[PDB]
Design a protein around this nucleic acid. Structure first.
Lengths: 94, 109, 301, 80, 109, 73, 96, 76, 111, 94, 98, 82
DNA sequence: CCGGCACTGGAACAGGATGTATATATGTGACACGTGCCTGGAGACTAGGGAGTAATCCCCTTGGCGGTTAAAACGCGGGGGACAGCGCGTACGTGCGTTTAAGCGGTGCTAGAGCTGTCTACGACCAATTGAGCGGCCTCGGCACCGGGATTCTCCAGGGGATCCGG
DNA sequence: CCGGATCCCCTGGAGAATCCCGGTGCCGAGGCCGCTCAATTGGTCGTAGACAGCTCTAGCACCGCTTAAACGCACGTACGCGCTGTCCCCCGCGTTTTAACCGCCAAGGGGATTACTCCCTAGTCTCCAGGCACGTGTCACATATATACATCCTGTTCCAGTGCCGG
């Protein structure tokens, strides 16, 4: 048929990285995929709104940073911003 | 208390079904003189004369749909609390004020 | 200008037209719109729910419609009146039916009113119709007494009259400025089938679906009185019993029951046993967030 | 199918109340809660069927219901 | 001639895909153009959130003596954390249930 | 120690007013006098049951323990 | 015999149901309700099993939160029993 | 034991009425299902106006038969 | 070349179809925008604006004023049942809230 | 100086065509403009979501009608749908 | 000499504020509070007059809605005076508190 | 530098706001809780507005940024933009 | 057995005080209409891909039937909580004098909002291609369910313990 | 003065619920293999905006004057909060019933897939007039003042209770 796009293997790899001896069920995997899709859609929509407000036709790292700060609360947002900045710096270096 | 509460909506008359409260058997369970006095406050159609010639009520004279509708409207007006004296006085004043202005249009209609 | 609200009942309208002085006419409540009635000589009165939401959302309506009357001669000849009185819609429809038909023994007041208003303009004609003491008294006699105490948004309903004035079905409305001509009949039917079809299409455009959508309509047919037809006797017995029961209903409807109920409750309370039965016959369930009490108390410190 | 709102039985309402942390339950509320459900589904299914009416489909999928729930702010996880 | 086609996720050192996120952003009709670092940052944020949620779910499962994560564990992990509860206070989790919340007045004296 | 009857009688008599003495007034008078009321208030109610039938103290408008009490004439 | 006082069994049911995530509403009666409600919107309409399960789960979550709000309203009014008045207040505050 | 009621517009409604029941309960059920006040409608059997205060067996309404609902309301 | 007229006047509409189409293109809601979609959206917007303005004018006539103030708009939006649900999460500056009056019930029947 | 786009002229024309004797001060006029912009944004977003869910790369009149039906409650949605259909029919015929 | 019993002037003020749409919160102290709050996020921050007016309008509307909810809760609790308990209840029901 | 001006939302102001809300009797502890709730709401809205302004390389909070911040929380305001 | 004279409380009413809506008069700032323009909308035309349509496969949805209970429904005793009544005292509404600072008006500075020109780097687009990710299969361990004890929580019964009554 | 018998708090035992251990089975979770498709890499090219420079504007700071409002205190009063009582209505439990569910089978409906084509809108070009910024006249109204009417509150008045005593 047609291939289905999902984050099952990525979520499983993250879980193994954080909890090597803890598994996951099919329903839990589907819930995690739905959560990831919903968060991705909300952040992308917020970034698109931010770009449209400033008459910007492109989405850069600043838009995603602002979307994360607006959406995620407090220390969770701060840690997410730190992780994203570290990932961007590592990508730029390599 | 001494007086029966008719003014405030807090009385259970609004929540009490007058259809069940008042019926033919309930009316027939009353003193004869009270029934005779009360019948004078009813229309002519529902009052007839029997063999003795005294005033009598028809079978549907009290348990028809129109009496139930009137009782329901009375309960609704109790809920609105229009029977209180504090508002009955202003209702009387509003009704009387109409005749003051009607004296100019009486001669034309 | 009181003109209290009038109830739409067949016996009420029969007694009202009897009070108008006309002897050979009455109204009947048809039940099946797919059936056929015998001798539906006069027009039809249709009660429909009138809401201004559609007109507000369709404000471009003052233009002349295709079915609207163009000339003024026929409108001048026929009886059409606007809505200049707040609650004369029932009387407007009744007079539209009565004054737009022949072979009727109209009452002397109605006869002289028709003679005076023959060949007139609908606005001032309706204004003169409203300024009639006998008409107002007749309307108020059969009017319900309870609504007059209410003012001490709203679901309004209106009448429309269907009449074959010149062999064509014309619709008369109190609020519509110009009557609409939409009767092409005159081939084989007795004007009944076209009226039924137009009622069917009006209902179809009203709801057009299975949900109720505030289904409130009432169609009545104006018919010559059946008493003389039966005279010229089970039919006579049923006619006279219907007339008597309707007259009783009309007499009972116009009487307010506030004083009677108050006296009955006061007598029961002073007798002593009231607090018994009123304790047993309770509609709303107890202990449900409702403050039920204060029957025999004062609550005045 | 008619008068199937009674399919939500009184113990079913009791189980929901116990899940929500309710010790004592009134009587008339049993008729009230179903009515609330009778509104909630009408506020959701009408949306989902609309999606069903937009995709040229004659059946309601899980993703359409998820979208209808997300429109009202009650996002659902586990079905897409 | 041609260098090894290493994934951008490996280059940036994050588990979540970068190409998939970039393709979804471009095909999502969010903006005319998408920057190079935006998908990387978004995937990093998604990976951080997923890692936090999975760690809390694993802690809940260990408290429940369970090796496999179930929707109940995810619901407990999301609702127990204040920040996650604020993030997902308007969401429904299938087969998740609710936290035990019994007030003091409910308990007998 | 001493019976509650005579002390509540003295408390209700010391009012020197036409209006009756309520249960709250009795409780506060006993608390001021230095008597255990919080752990035996229900017992105080039983004390009323030992005198209401006696006729030395009559309820004014209230029923049972709730209300006001006055000395009979 | 041995009968628990009114309230103990209710607390036990609260503890048991809050510790489990089964389906409180029977699936088949709820499915018929969904089918009959959707009949007014579009006749001859089919429903997937996953869609019915998702809708039932969403209704379960919505009703549990409504009952929690109702219980909090009852507690605020110095009352334990939930009443229709509490549900009406909770729905009016939430804007429903 | 079921019964059918028509409207002047042709709409069909299904009710459950016991043979020994009364028309007041029928009006109450109608009000519950569609919402109009009971005093605003009247029942008709074969063109005959139903009289309030009488049971169904009085006029011999058969099972699964048809009745009519005529909505008598206020206006103008 | 024939006479140039706006597409809004082509459909007998007041709101600009061209402006709506331009905003849809610039908003980047989708890769492509249909020809009839801007007309439909402009018609819906015009209908909603007409309804709100008519209700506000009715409120102003009730207030005996010939200008629409934010108070009139707030009253018109809150009084209407369908508009209140549509705008149940909006704030109107200098609008206020509905007072506690019962004068709305007026079964007026006139020309 | 740059120009700012607004619906003031069109809203005033609609007001004149519904209430010729009524005007609007430029304090509630901004409220009407904000309402129009918000409704336009919500309908456009709903249409974009509908197109994305059905793998549609274009926004046609059907998407706008579906968005109007979803957003507007009660008979307001029906009247808006009827007006939009009539406008589209008139535009296509001419 | 002459004075009104409690419950009358309050109703008159309620009607007056229902029929009027002025700014109940004084503009200058509200603006100063906004300036103080906008220091933990970014220092040396400027606010337009329209921005602070919009903030004041939004805060007034939110507080009016919250007060209506608290009044509804108090009426539900068979009480006239409002307490912080109904404020907490309204915040929880609206989802703001939890 | 200014600190602790929450008293600027004075007790009569809270009383008038509750009067607009239909409240006829106000307890003495209502004012403090109302001030706290208003402070929390202001903190949230101002944080969102500051984030929006910083995203735009600006240090002046415009009215449109405030409108966007209010709309992001579901409390969109009309009359200060679109 | 019972009623004129000496005490009260309680429903009803009148008058002063207060607030508000109504009838004119002001002058005013904001709203409505005319004008220059310029830029965004409109008319033509093309092309290329997204969409409409036909045919087809089969996944899944609907319909039906046989048992089996798990669960809903009905009936009754009753415990305890919902509701009512009463009392209190303190906390809040109302009012007034006072102090505060909010609001209005004019002045001044300037840091930053907003616009413009360059030119550059960053992102869209297309080919080659290749490795990662999706689909299908398999197996073996984690969990649901089973049952048996053992522990824990509930509730009623027996009894130490404080208390008013009577010769 | 000191034997009766009533009601209050502690423990113990019967009884139901649930944890805790261990066995069994089963089914799906994760690993593996084959494929395929879209993410990488390389290169080109077009343009979005980064940045520097200029303009101007409105936001901040400060001063003064006026008076609207907040503050604090006083005083009364009425409303929320115990406290008690009642009584009736859901809770809990027992018995009946009833249909939900699991399992199976079958039919076919349309959801998804592939191919074909066709036509519809993005893109480009050119023209032109619609609306926007600006300017200006005028009137709707915010304001002010005076007056009459609707409420509110309190003080005063007329009608219904007890308490006394010897034909």
């Amino acid at each position: 048929r047609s291939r289905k796009e999902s984050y099952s293997i990525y979520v499983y790899k993250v879980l193994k990285q954080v909890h090597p001896d803890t598994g996951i069920s099919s329903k839990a995997m589907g819930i995690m995929n739905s959560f990831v899709n919903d968060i991705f859609e909300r952040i992308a929509g917020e970034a698109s709104r931010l770009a449209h407000y400033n008459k910007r036709s492109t989405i850069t790292s600043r838009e995603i940073q602002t979307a994360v700060r607006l959406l995620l609360p407090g220390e969770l947002a701060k840690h997410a911003v730190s992780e994203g900045t570290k990932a961007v710096t590592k990508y730029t270096s390599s | 208390g001494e007086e029966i509460d008719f003014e405030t909506p807090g009385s259970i008359l609004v929540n009490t079904n007058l259809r069940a409260l008042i019926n033919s058997r309930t009316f027939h369970a009353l003193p004869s003189h009270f029934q005779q006095q009360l019948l004078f406050l009813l229309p002519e159609v529902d009052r007839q004369v029997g063999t003795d010639g005294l005033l009598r009520l028809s079978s549907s004279a009290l348990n028809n749909e129109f009496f139930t509708h009137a009782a329901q409207s009375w309960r609704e007006r109790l809920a609105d609390g229009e029977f209180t004296h504090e508002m009955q006085v202003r209702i009387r004043q509003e009704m009387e004020k109409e005749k003051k202005v009607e004296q100019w249009k009486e001669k034309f209609f | 200008k009181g003109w209290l609200e009038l109830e739409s009942d067949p016996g009420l309208f029969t007694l009202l037209v009897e009070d108008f002085g006309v002897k050979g006419v009455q109204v009947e409540e048809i039940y099946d719109l797919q059936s056929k009635c015998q001798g539906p000589v006069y027009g039809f009165i249709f009660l429909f729910k009138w809401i201004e939401e559609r007109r507000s959302r369709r404000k471009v309506s003052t233009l002349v419609d295709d079915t609207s009357v163009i000339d003024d001669d026929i409108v001048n000849n026929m009886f059409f009146a606007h809505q200049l009185i707040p609650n004369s819609s029932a009387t407007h429809a009744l007079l539209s039916v009565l004054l737009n038909c022949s072979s009727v023994d109209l009452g002397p007041t109605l006869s002289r009113m028709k003679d005076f208003t023959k060949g007139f303009s609908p606005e001032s004609k309706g204004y003169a119709i409203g300024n009639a003491p006998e008409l107002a008294k007749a309307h108020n006699s059969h009017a319900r007494p309870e609504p007059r105490h209410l003012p001490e948004t709203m679901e309004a309903f209106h009448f429309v009259s269907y009449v074959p004035i010149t062999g064509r079905l014309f619709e008369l409305d109190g609020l519509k400025v110009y009557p609409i001509d939409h009767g092409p009949w005159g081939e084989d039917e007795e004007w009944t089938d076209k009226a039924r079809r137009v009622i069917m299409e009006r209902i179809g455009l009203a709801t057009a679906g299975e949900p109720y959508h505030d289904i409130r309509f009432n169609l009545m047919a104006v018919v010559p009185d059946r008493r003389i037809k039966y005279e010229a006797e089970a039919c006579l017995k049923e006619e006279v019993e219907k007339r008597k029961k309707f007259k009783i209903d009309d007499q009972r409807r116009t009487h307010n029951y506030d004083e009677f109920i108050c006296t009955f409750i006061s007598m029961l309370a002073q007798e002593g046993m009231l607090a018994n039965l009123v304790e047993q016959n309770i509609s709303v369930r107890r202990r449900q967030g409702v403050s039920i009490g204060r029957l025999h108390k004062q609550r005045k410190p | 199918l008619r008068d199937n709102i009674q399919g939500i039985t009184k113990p079913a309402i009791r189980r929901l109340a116990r899940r929500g942390g309710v010790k004592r339950i009134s009587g008339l509320i049993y008729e009230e809660t179903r009515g609330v459900l009778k509104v909630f589904l009408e506020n959701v299914i009408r949306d989902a069927v609309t999606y069903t009416e937009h995709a040229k489909r004659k059946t309601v999928t899980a993703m359409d219901v998820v979208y209808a729930l997300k429109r009202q702010g009650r996002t659902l996880y586990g079905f897409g | 001639a041609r260098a090894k086609a290493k994934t951008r996720s490996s280059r940036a050192g994050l588990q979540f895909p970068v190409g998939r996120v970039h393709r979804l952003l471009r095909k999502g009709n969010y903006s005319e153009r998408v920057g190079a670092g935006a998908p990387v940052y978004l995937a990093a944020v998604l990976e951080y959130l997923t890692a936090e949620i999975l760690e809390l779910a694993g802690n809940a499962a260990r408290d429940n003596k369970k090796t496999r994560i179930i929707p109940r564990h995810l619901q407990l992990a999301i609702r127990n954390d204040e920040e996650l509860n604020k993030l997902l206070g308007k969401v429904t989790i299938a087969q998740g249930g609710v936290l035990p919340n019994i007030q003091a007045v409910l308990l007998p004296k | 120690g001493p019976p509650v009857s005579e002390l509540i009688t003295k408390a209700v008599a010391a009012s020197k007013e036409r209006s009756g003495v309520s249960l709250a007034a009795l409780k506060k008078a006993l608390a001021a006098a230095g008597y255990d009321v919080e752990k035996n208030n229900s017992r105080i109610k039983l004390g009323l049951k030992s005198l209401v039938s006696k006729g030395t103290l009559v309820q004014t408008k209230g029923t049972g323990a709730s209300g006001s009490f006055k000395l009979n004439k | 015999p041995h009968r628990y006082r009114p309230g103990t069994v209710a607390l036990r049911e609260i503890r048991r149901y809050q510790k489990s995530t089964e389906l409180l509403i029977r699936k088949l009666p709820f499915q018929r309700l969904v089918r009959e409600i959707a009949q007014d919107f579009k006749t001859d309409l089919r429903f997937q099993s996953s869609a019915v399960m998702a809708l039932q789960e969403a209704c379960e979550a919505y009703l549990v939160g409504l009952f929690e709000d109702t219980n909090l309203c009852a507690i605020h009014a110095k009352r334990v029993t939930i009443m229709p008045k509490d549900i009406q207040l909770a729905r009016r505050i939430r804007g429903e | 034991m079921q019964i059918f009621v028509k409207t002047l517009t042709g709409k069909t409604i299904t009710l459950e009425v016991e043979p020994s029941d009364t028309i007041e309960n029928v009006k109450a059920k109608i009000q519950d299902k569609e919402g109009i006040p009971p005093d605003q409608q009247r029942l008709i059997f074969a063109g005959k106006q139903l009289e309030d205060g009488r049971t169904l067996s009085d006029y011999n309404i058969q099972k699964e038969s048809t009745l009519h609902l005529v909505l008598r309301l206020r206006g103008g």
